[PDB]
C-alpha cells in the first residue's frame, strides 16, 4: 500500500497523486484525434475504430458541439466526456444571455479549468479521465485553439493532438506551414496524416472523420461528410496505400 | 545518455538501407530513450 | 506518523507532506528572481516552450492580478491559476465593501488565512503555490511581499524563486549593501545579472520575461523588446 | 470494508444471509387450492411456565389479504406496519379493494433503502430478515404469492418456507394436485406439520387459517384444530 | 462529501490515559523562540526575542505581539499562522461583546473564550487543535493581571514565567532572580538578562520585542527606549 | 490481492487505470435470462424467456410496458428495475403534459443515463447490474438501444443479452441480410432459432417460458404471452 | 467509499462494557482528593490541593469548589479543559427552573440532566465521551441537607460521607468507621476530616495552604455559605495534631502500664 491511492485530497512524496497521474495514462491509451487551426479557421479531425457491422452511431461518436458556434473533440471515455460537456454548454448558455454576448473560448475553458482543479483537491469525487479539444472562429479575434487536459494543464496551440500516436503525429505537423494554405487545403492534408497514421494502429478497419469551423462556415460548427469528406481521401489512396 | 540517442539513429538508418541521416531519426530516438528511463 | 488517510501533531515538528509541498514545487526549469528597489521593483522570468506547435503569446506565469498589484506565481499551474481566481474575486470584493483600494499587504495575510484552514483539515490539503506580490504603495512606498503554503508571509528587501533559490541569494546579498544607488534602468541591469549567473544562460530576446513595477505610476508592465535588448547590450558593453 | 459494496461476484452479501436466519426459523406452510388459499404455521413453544397464547405469527393484513412472515421477527413488525396502513389508504382515495399483488409490491419498493450509498436512500443500514407468503382471494380467484427476502416476489400455490424446507417442498409435490378439495389439503398440510416435528402435537403451537369467499378471512380456534387432529 | 469526514478526534483516550496529540504540542510550544513575562506589579513587561535568519526582511513587518485591546494584548511561543489565526477571531468576538456594553474588558472572559475555541476543537474531529501557549498580558485598575493559556485549554496565574527553547531551565534561572519589589525599568533589565541567559544570539533593537501594560494599559516601547535600557545594563 | 480495497474504492483507479466496478457489473448482466432484440427498422421483435424457479410457480415477466409506443425487456435483478422505470414513466408524462409530444426515445435514453453516471462519479452507488433492451417506435421509425449499468448507451440494429449472448450474435449477423425491411414472420423464427442459440441447449423448446413482443409502423405495445405465441408459431 | 478513515471507536466488543469509558476512570482516581462528609447540622467539604508555588497566585478562594447554586456548591474531579465547559449548562438549566417554577430547582433533578447528556454520546453522537465527577453539597426546605455524588458511568449515589480522589478504598474504610449513625456535629466532623485526610497524604507535614475547607449551614436566607480562612484552617490543623499527640502519648502510658516490652 502507497497510501494515497485512498486519498485524492492530500500531497504525496511525488507531490500530486498516482491517481492523477493515472488518468493521465487512460486518455493515451485511448484512439486517436488532431486538430490543426489557420489562419481562415481550424479544422477537427479524429479517428474511430470499427467494432462489428450490427451496432450504429446516432448519438454516439467522438465529435461533440459546445453551444453553436463552438465545436469540441475528445480522447478518454465517451459517457464521462458527455456528462462534462452538457452541463458547459448550459453554462455558457447563462452567460450568452446574461452578459449578452457570444461568449470567448477563453472564458469557457477558465470555467473548465477550475472545475477540474476543484476536484484535485478533495477525495469525494474522483476525477473526469478525459481531455478536450475545442476552439472556434471568432469574427473579432481570429482562430483559436485549445486544450485541457485532465492534469489541470490547458493552454493556446497551433496544433495539438492525443491519443497513443501523440508524439508521432506532432512531428509530422510540426514539418508543415505556419499558414497552412487555406483550410480547404488543410481537410485533404489532414486525411493523409490520419490515413498514414492507421498503418501504426492496424488491426480493424476504421471511419475517418472530419469536421471544421471555415471562413465559409461563417464561425459556425459543422462536420465534414459529404462528397467532401471522399475526395481528400481519394487523394491518400493515390499517394500511398498505407 | 547521448551517445546512445546517436547510436540509435544509427540503427534506423541501417534498417532504411542508408549511410543517409535525417533529422528524423534523432527526434525519434531522443524520445524512445527518454520513456525508457527513469 | 500517519500521513496515511490524516495529518496529525507528530514530534517531527514539520509534516512531511508540508516539506514535500516545498520542494517539488515547479516540475520544469523556469526559474524567477525579484528585486525591489525605490526606483523600481522588478521581477525577471523567462520564456521557454517544447516546440512550436504551441502558441506563447497568450503562454505566460505573470500575471496582472490588478492596475496597481502584479503576481508572479511559482506553483503547479492547475494550482497557481485557481489561486488567482480566487484572489481576483476577494480584492474586487475588498473594493467594493471599503470603497478604497486594497492594500498589497493585506491581501498576502488574506490570503494566508485562508491557506492555515485547510492546514487544519485532513478532508482536503492546501493549494501548493508560492506567490510573490509586488506592488506601488503610496504609503510605504514600493512593497514587495513573498508568501509560501505554510501560512507564512513576509516581505523582503529581495527574493529569487525557482529550484536555486539559495544559489541566486549569495548573488543577492553581495548586491543588496549598495542598491540605492542604481538608478532606473541600472535596477533591471543588475536584474537581469543575477539569473544570467545562475542559470548561466546569456539570454535571448525571446528567452526572458521581465516584468516592472514603476514609481509615480500604478503601471506593471512587462517590457517591450527594445528596451529589453537595449539592457542585454548594456551588459555586453562591461564584459 | 463497506457494505455498501456490490460485492465481486456482483451478488450482493447480505442478501445471501438472511436465507441463512430464516433456516433457523419455524417452518410455515401455504397450499393453495382450487378455491380457497390455507397457510398452516408452527407458532411453537419449549416452556411449560411460557403462554404462546398471547403468541402468533400468522396474521391478517385484511380481511381479503392475509400474509404470513418466517425470519427476525421482530423485523416483520415493522414490516406489516407499513403495508396495512398503505393498503387502508386505497380505501380513502378510491374506497375499493386492493389486490394481492399490488400490495406485495408497494412493500418491495421499502424493501430497498439499505446502505447510506447513492444507490439507496439511507434510512436502514440492511434490510428485513424476513420472507413472507401472501395470500388473497379477489377476482382473480384464491393466489399465492412468496416474497422473497431478496425484495421480489414470485407467484406461488404451494409453497413451504422454513428449516425444512428442502425435505417439504419435495413432500409438498407428491400431495399437491392441480384440482384437491379443501378440506382434504388441511389434512395433507397436516402430514408434513407431523413430519418436522419433535415436540408434541397439541392445538397449542400450531395455528390453521384459510381464507374462503364464503365467509372472509377467518382463524382457526382450538377446538376447531382438535378436530382437524381427531381426522388423522 | 462536504459534511463526512471524521466525525470523532484524532486525539484519543488512551489506556495510559493521557491524550496523545496534546503531548505533542507540549514539543510544538518547546519549539519556540524564547519568551518571559514579569509582572512589575503596578506595569506589567512582556518580552521576547525575534531570531532573524534571512538578511532579507523588511521594516519590523509582522510582530509577535499584537494588541487584542487597548487594555489587554497577546504574546506566545508555538506556530506563527496559528498565532496570527488566533488573535482573529479572539479580536472579533472581544469587540463585538464590550460594545453591547460599554464597560471594559474583564481579563478571565478573554480567557474564557480562547480556551473554549481550543476545547471545541479537542471535542470535534476533521479539525487539530492549535498548537500555541499564549500569555495574556493587560492591566486595569488594582486588579491582579500577567496569566497563561495552554494549548490544552487550561490557565493559570502567575507573577513571572518564560516560553520557549529550555524553557525548564530559563524559569529555573528566573525563579531565584525574581524576588519582591521592583520598577518597571528593573523589570525590563531583568527580562533582558534572563531572555539572554536562555540564549543570545545577539541582542539588538530589532532582536528584543518588549511591551508593557502599565499607564492606561497596554504601551509599545520605541526602539530607542529599550536601547536605553541595553546601555543601563547590558 | 487487493481485491477489498477496488472493492472499497468506488472512486478506484488501478495502474493499469481499470475500474473493477464496472467489471463486477458486467459480471452481473451475463447471470440474468436470455433477451434477444431485433429490428427490420420498420418493425421490432424482441424474443425474451421467462423463467420459473421452481416446478409449483409460474414464470416471472421480464418484458414491461414502459408505455404505449415504447418497451423494455430486462435482463439483471428484478428489484432494481422497478426504481428505475419510475422515473422513465414520470418523464414520459411531463412530456405529455407540457409538451404533448411523445419525445425521441434517443433523447430520452442520453438523459437517463446522466444522472447515473455522476454519482459513480463520486462516494456511494453500487452499480445497479442490469442491462436492457430498449426498444421504442417514434418518429424516424423504431430504433433500438442498450443500455447498461455502465451507461454504454449504443444503438444496434439488434443485439442481445444473456449467457452465451455471443452465438446468438453470429447467427444475427449472418441472417442479418435476410432481415431487410419487411416480414413480421420470419423475423420470430429466427429469434426462436436465434434463442436456442443463447440456452445451453440440451433444454428443448417450450412454449410456457417464451414471450414474444412486437412494435411496427401502425403497432404499439402488445405482448404475446404463454400459450398466445402458438398462432404465430 | 464515504468513510473508512475511522478507528472503529465507540463501539462494543466481547467486553460487554465500553473500553473507553472503563479508560477515564483510571484518570478519576489521579487527581485531589477532595471529601464530603454529611452531618445532621450542616454539610462539610475538604479538598486537598494540588501544586502550588510561589510564583503561581491566588485570585479566589474558588480553584476547586465552584458554585452552581446560592445552596448548591461541587467538587469537580476531572481535568481542568472539559469542566468549564460542562459546568456552564449545569449552571444554565437551574436558571431555566427559576424562571418558569419560580423557587430553586430541586437537587436531584440538576444530577438527572448531566447523565442524560453522556448516555446519548454512548448510544451514538460522533463526539468523544468525556469523564468528570462531582460531589454535590446542597441544602433543602422540605428534604433537609443533600449530598450526592455523580460519576460519568451513569451511577450517581447519595451518601452520608464519601470521599473520592487518590487512596479511594482505605479512606472509604477509615470513614466507615470513625463514623456513627447520626449524633454528628461539625466540631467532630472538623476533628474528622483532617484525619483522614492525612493519612492519605504522602507529605508529612500538613498546612493550611494544601487544604481548602469549607462548611455549608443554614441560619438565614436558605443558606449561609462559609469559605473558610487560612489562619482558621491552619488553627483547627494544630488543634487536631496537638489531639494526635495527645492520643499517641495516652496508648505509651497505658503500654507502660501493662508492662513495658
Given at each position: 500500500?502507497?497510501?494515497y491511492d ?16 493515472y ?19 481550424v ?10 457491422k ?8 467522438r ?25 458547459a ?21 477558465d ?12 477525495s469525494a ?16 479575434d ?15 496551440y497551433?496544433?495539438c ?9 506532432k ?5 508543415l ?66 | ?38 | 506518523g ?8 507528530s514530534?517531527?515538528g514539520?509534516?512531511?507532506?508540508v ?8 516540475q520544469?526549469?523556469?526559474?524567477s ?16 516552450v517544447p516546440?512550436?506547435?504551441l ?10 492580478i ?5 503576481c508572479?506565481?511559482?506553483?503547479m499551474?492547475?494550482?497557481s ?6 484572489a ?11 470603497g478604497?483600494?486594497?492594500?498589497v ?36 512606498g ?37 542598491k540605492f ?5 541600472q535596477?533591471v541591469?543588475?536584474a537581469?545579472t ?7 544562460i ?16 500604478p ?17 555586453a558593453?562591461?564584459? | ?37 390455507c ?17 402468533e ?7 381479503h ?22 393498503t ?14 399490488s ?13 447510506e ?6 434510512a ?10 401472501f ?15 431478496s ?5 406461488c ?5 422454513g ?23 388441511i389434512?395433507s398440510?397436516?402430514?408434513?406439520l ?14 390453521l387459517?384459510?381464507?374462503?369467499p ?10 376447531e ?6 381426522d388423522? | ?12 483516550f ?15 510550544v ?9 509582572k512589575?506589579?503596578?506595569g506589567?513587561?512582556?518580552?521576547t526575542?525575534?531570531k ?13 505581539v ?35 456594553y ?12 480562547v ?22 498580558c ?8 500577567l496569566?497563561?493559556?495552554?494549548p ?14 529550555n ?32 540564549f ?14 502599565n499607564?492606561a ?18 | 490481492?487487493f481485491?477489498?480495497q ?21 459480471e ?6 436470455a ?33 404505449n ?21 414520470q ?10 409530444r ?21 462516494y456511494g ?32 440494429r ?7 449472448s ?19 414472420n ?9 434463442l ?5 441447449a ?32 | ?14 467486553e ?16 485531589g ?6 452531618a445532621n447540622?450542616g ?14 497566585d491566588?485570585?479566589?478562594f ?13 467538587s ?10 460542562l459546568?456552564?449548562?449545569l449552571?444554565?438549566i ?29 448510544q ?16 433543602d426546605?422540605?428534604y433537609?441537607?443533600?449530598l450526592y ?10 451518601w ?24 454528628m456535629?461539625?466540631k ?29 449551614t ?32 495516652e ?11
Open positions: 500500500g502507497t497510501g485512498l486519498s485524492a485530497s492530500t500531497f504525496s512524496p511525488d507531490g500530486r497523486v498516482f491517481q492523477v497521474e488518468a493521465m495514462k487512460a486518455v493515451e491509451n485511448s484512439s486517436t484525434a488532431i486538430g490543426i487551426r489557420c489562419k481562415d479557421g479544422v477537427f479531425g479524429v479517428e474511430k475504430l470499427v467494432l462489428s450490427l451496432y450504429e452511431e446516432g448519438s454516439n461518436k465529435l461533440f458541439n459546445v453551444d453553436r458556434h463552438v465545436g469540441m473533440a475528445v480522447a478518454g471515455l465517451l459517457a464521462d466526456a458527455r456528462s462534462l460537456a452538457d452541463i454548454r448550459e453554462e455558457a448558455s447563462n452567460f450568452r444571455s446574461n452578459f449578452g454576448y457570444n461568449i470567448p473560448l477563453k472564458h469557457l475553458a470555467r473548465v479549468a477550475m472545475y477540474v482543479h476543484a476536484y484535485t483537491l478533495y469525487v474522483r476525477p473526469f479521465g478525459c481531455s478536450f479539444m475545442l476552439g472556434s472562429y471568432s469574427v473579432n481570429g482562430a483559436q485553439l485549445y486544450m485541457i487536459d485532465p492534469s489541470g494543464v490547458s493552454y493556446g497551433w496544433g493532438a492525443i491519443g497513443k500516436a501523440r508524439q508521432a503525429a512531428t509530422e505537423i510540426e514539418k506551414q505556419m499558414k497552412e494554405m487555406t483550410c480547404r487545403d488543410i481537410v485533404k492534408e489532414v486525411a493523409k496524416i490520419i490515413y498514414i497514421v492507421h498503418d501504426e494502429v492496424k488491426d480493424k478497419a476504421f471511419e475517418l472523420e472530419l469536421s471544421w469551423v471555415g471562413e465559409l462556415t461563417n464561425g459556425r460548427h459543422e462536420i465534414v461528410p459529404k462528397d467532401i469528406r471522399e475526395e481528400a481521401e481519394k487523394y491518400a489512396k493515390e499517394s500511398l496505400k498505407e | 545518455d547521448l551517445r546512445n540517442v546517436c547510436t540509435e539513429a544509427g540503427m534506423f538508418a541501417i534498417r532504411a538501407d542508408h549511410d543517409f541521416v535525417v533529422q528524423e531519426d534523432f527526434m525519434k530516438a531522443v524520445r524512445k530513450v527518454a520513456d525508457s528511463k527513469k | 500517519f500521513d496515511r488517510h490524516i495529518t496529525i501533531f514530534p517531527e514539520r509534516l512531511y507532506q516539506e514535500y509541498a516545498f520542494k517539488a514545487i515547479n520544469g526549469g523556469l526559474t528572481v525579484a528585486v525591489r528597489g525605490k526606483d523600481c521593483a522588478v521581477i525577471v522570468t523567462q520564456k521557454k516546440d512550436k506547435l502558441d506563447s503569446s497568450t503562454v505566460t506565469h505573470l500575471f496582472k490588478t492596475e496597481n498589484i502584479g508572479v506565481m511559482t506553483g499551474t492547475a494550482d491559476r485557481s489561486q488567482v481566481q480566487r481576483r474575486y476577494e480584492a474586487a470584493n475588498w473594493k467594493y465593501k471599503y478604497y483600494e486594497i492594500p499587504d493585506m491581501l498576502c495575510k488574506r490570503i494566508a488565512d485562508i491557506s492555515q484552514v485547510y492546514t487544519q483539515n485532513a478532508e482536503m490539503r492546501p493549494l501548493g503555490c508560492c506567490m510573490i506580490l509586488i506592488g506601488i504603495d503610496e504609503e510605504q514600493p512593497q514587495v511581499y513573498k508568501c509560501d503554503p505554510a501560512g507564512y508571509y513576509c516581505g523582503f528587501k529581495a527574493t529569487a524563486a525557482g529550484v536555486k533559490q539559495t544559489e541566486s541569494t549569495s548573488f543577492l546579498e553581495k548586491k543588496v549593501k549598495k544607488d542604481w538608478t532606473f534602468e535596477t541591469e543588475t537581469i543575477c539569473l544570467s549567473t545562475v542559470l548561466s546569456d539570454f535571448k530576446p525571446s528567452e526572458i520575461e521581465v516584468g516592472v513595477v514603476t514609481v509615480e505610476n503601471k506593471f508592465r512587462i517590457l517591450t523588446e527594445a528596451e529589453i535588448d537595449a539592457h542585454l547590450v548594456a551588459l558593453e562591461r564584459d | 470494508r463497506g457494505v455498501n459494496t456490490f460485492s465481486p461476484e456482483g451478488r450482493l452479501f447480505q442478501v445471501e444471509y438472511a436465507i441463512e436466519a430464516i433456516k433457523l426459523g419455524s417452518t410455515a406452510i401455504g397450499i393453495q387450492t382450487s378455491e380457497g388459499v397457510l398452516a404455521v408452527e407458532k411453537r413453544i419449549t416452556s411449560p411456565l411460557m403462554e404462546p397464547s398471547s403468541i405469527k400468522i396474521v391478517e393484513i385484511d380481511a389479504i392475509g400474509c404470513a412472515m418466517s425470519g427476525l421477527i421482530a423485523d416483520a413488525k415493522t414490516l406489516i406496519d407499513k403495508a396495512r396502513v398503505e387502508q389508504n386505497h380505501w380513502f382515495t378510491y374506497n375499493e379493494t386492493m389486490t394481492v399483488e400490495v406485495t409490491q408497494a412493500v418491495s419498493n421499502l424493501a430497498l433503502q439499505f446502505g450509498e447513492d444507490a439507496d436512500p439511507g436502514m443500514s440492511r434490510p428485513f430478515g424476513v420472507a413472507l407468503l395470500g388473497g382471494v379477489d377476482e382473480k380467484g384464491p393466489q399465492l404469492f412468496h416474497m422473497d427476502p425484495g421480489t416476489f414470485v407467484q400455490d404451494a409453497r413451504a418456507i428449516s425444512a424446507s428442502e425435505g417439504a417442498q419435495s413432500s409438498l409435490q407428491e400431495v399437491y394436485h392441480k384440482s384437491m378439495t379443501l378440506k382434504e389439503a389434512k398440510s397436516l402430514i408434513i407431523k413430519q418436522v416435528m419433535e415436540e408434541k402435537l397439541n392445538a397449542t403451537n400450531i395455528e387459517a384459510t381464507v374462503q364464503g365467509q372472509n378471512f377467518h382463524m382457526f380456534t382450538k377446538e384444530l382438535e378436530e382437524v387432529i381427531k388423522i | 462529501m462536504a459534511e463526512r469526514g471524521y466525525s470523532f478526534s484524532l486525539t484519543t488512551s489506556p495510559s490515559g493521557k491524550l496523545v496529540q496534546i503531548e505533542y504540542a507540549l514539543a510544538a518547546a519549539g519556540g523562540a524564547p519568551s518571559v513575562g514579569i512589575a506589579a503596578n506589567v513587561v512582556l518580552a526575542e525575534k532573524q535568519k534571512s538578511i532579507l526582511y523588511d521594516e519590523r513587518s509582522v510582530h509577535k499584537e494588541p487584542i485591546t487597548k487594555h489587554i494584548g497577546l504574546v506566545y511561543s508555538g506556530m506563527g499562522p496559528d498565532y496570527r489565526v488566533l488573535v482573529h477571531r479572539a479580536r472579533k468576538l472581544a469587540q463585538q461583546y464590550y460594545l453591547v460599554q464597560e471594559p474588558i474583564p481579563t478571565a472572559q478573554l480567557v474564557q473564550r480556551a473554549s475555541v481550543m476545547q471545541e476543537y479537542t471535542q470535534s474531529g476533521g479539525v487539530r487543535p492549535f498548537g500555541v501557549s499564549l500569555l495574556i493587560g492591566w486595569n485598575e488594582g486588579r491582579p493581571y496569566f497563561q493559556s495552554d490544552s485549554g487550561a490557565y493559570f496565574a502567575w507573577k513571572a514565567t518564560a516560553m520557549g527553547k524553557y525548564v531551565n530559563g524559569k529555573t534561572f528566573l525563579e531565584k532572580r525574581y524576588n519582591e519589589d521592583l520598577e518597571l525599568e528593573d523589570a525590563i533589565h531583568t527580562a533582558i538578562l534572563t531572555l539572554k541567559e536562555s543570545e544570539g545577539q541582542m539588538t533593537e530589532d532582536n528584543i520585542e518588549v511591551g508593557i501594560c499607564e494599559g497596554f504601551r509599545r516601547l520605541t526602539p530607542t527606549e529599550v536601547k536605553d535600557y541595553l546601555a543601563a545594563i547590558a | 490481492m481485491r477489498n477496488y472493492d472499497n474504492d468506488v472512486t478506484v483507479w488501478s495502474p493499469q487505470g481499470r475500474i473493477h466496478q464496472i467489471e463486477y457489473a458486467m452481473a448482466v451475463k447471470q440474468g435470462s433477451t434477444v432484440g431485433l429490428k427490420s427498422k420498420t418493425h421490432a421483435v424482441l424474443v425474451a424467456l421467462k423463467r420459473a424457479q421452481s416446478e409449483l410457480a409460474a414464470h416471472q415477466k421480464k418484458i414491461l410496458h414502459v408505455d409506443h415504447i418497451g423494455i425487456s430486462i435482463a439483471g435483478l428484478t428489484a432494481d428495475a422497478r426504481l428505475l422505470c419510475n422515473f422513465m414513466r418523464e414520459c408524462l411531463d412530456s405529455r403534459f407540457v409538451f404533448d411523445p419525445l425521441p426515445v434517443s433523447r430520452l435514453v442520453s438523459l437517463i443515463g446522466s444522472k447515473t453516471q455522476i454519482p459513480t462519479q463520486r452507488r453500487r452499480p445497479y447490474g442490469v442491462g436492457l433492451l430498449i426498444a421504442g417506435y417514434d418518429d424516424m421509425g423504431p430504433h433500438i438501444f442498450q443500455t447498461c449499468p455502465s451507461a454504454n448507451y449504443f444503438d444496434c439488434a443485439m442481445s443479452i444473456g449467457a452465451r455471443q452465438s446468438a450474435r453470429t447467427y444475427l449477423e449472418r441472417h442479418m441480410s435476410e432481415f431487410m425491411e419487411c416480414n413480421l420470419e423475423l420470430v423464427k429466427h429469434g426462436l432459432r436465434a436456442r442459440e443463447t440456452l445451453p440440451e433444454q428443448d423448446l417450450t412454449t410456457k417460458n417464451v414471450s414474444i413482443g412486437i412494435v411496427g409502423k401502425d403497432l404499439e405495445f402488445t405482448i404475446y404471452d404463454d400459450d398466445d405465441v402458438s398462432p404465430f408459431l | 467509499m464515504s468513510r473508512r478513515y475511522d478507528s472503529r471507536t465507540t463501539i462494543f466488543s466481547p460487554g462494557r465500553l473500553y473507553q469509558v472503563e479508560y477515564a476512570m483510571e484518570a478519576i482516581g489521579h487527581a482528593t477532595c471529601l464530603g462528609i454529611l447540622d454539610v462539610l467539604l475538604a479538598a486537598e490541593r494540588r501544586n502550588i508555588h510561589k510564583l503561581l491566588e485570585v479566589f474558588s480553584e476547586k469548589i465552584y458554585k452552581l447554586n446560592e445552596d448548591m456548591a461541587c469537580v474531579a476531572g481535568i481542568t479543559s472539559d469542566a468549564n465547559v459546568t456552564n449548562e449552571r444554565l437551574a436558571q431555566r427552573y427559576l424562571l418558569q417554577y419560580q423557587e430553586p430547582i430541586p437537587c436531584e433533578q440538576l444530577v438527572t440532566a448531566l447523565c442524560d447528556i453522556k448516555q446519548a454520546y454512548t451514538f453522537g460522533g463526539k468523544r465521551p468525556f469523564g468528570v465527577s462531582l460531589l454535590y453539597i446542597g441544602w426546605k422540605h433537609g441537607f443533600q455524588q455523580s460519576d460519568p458511568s451513569g451511577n450517581y449515589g447519595g452520608k460521607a464519601t470521599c473520592i480522589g487518590n487512596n479511594s478504598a482505605a479512606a472509604v474504610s477509615m470513614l466507615k468507621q470513625d463514623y456513627k449513625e447520626g449524633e456535629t461539625l467532630s466532623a472538623l476533628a474528622l476530616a483532617i484525619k483522614v485526610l492525612n493519612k492519605t497524604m504522602d507529605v508529612s507535614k500538613l498546612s493550611a495552604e494544601k487544604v481548602e475547607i469549607a462548611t455549608l443554614r441560619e438565614n436566607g436558605k443558606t449561609v455559605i462559609r469559605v473558610l480562612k487560612q489562619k482558621e484552617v491552619e488553627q483547627l490543623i494544630k488543634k487536631h495534631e496537638e489531639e494526635e499527640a495527645k492520643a499517641e502519648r496508648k505509651k502510658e497505658k503500654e507502660q502500664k501493662e508492662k513495658d516490652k
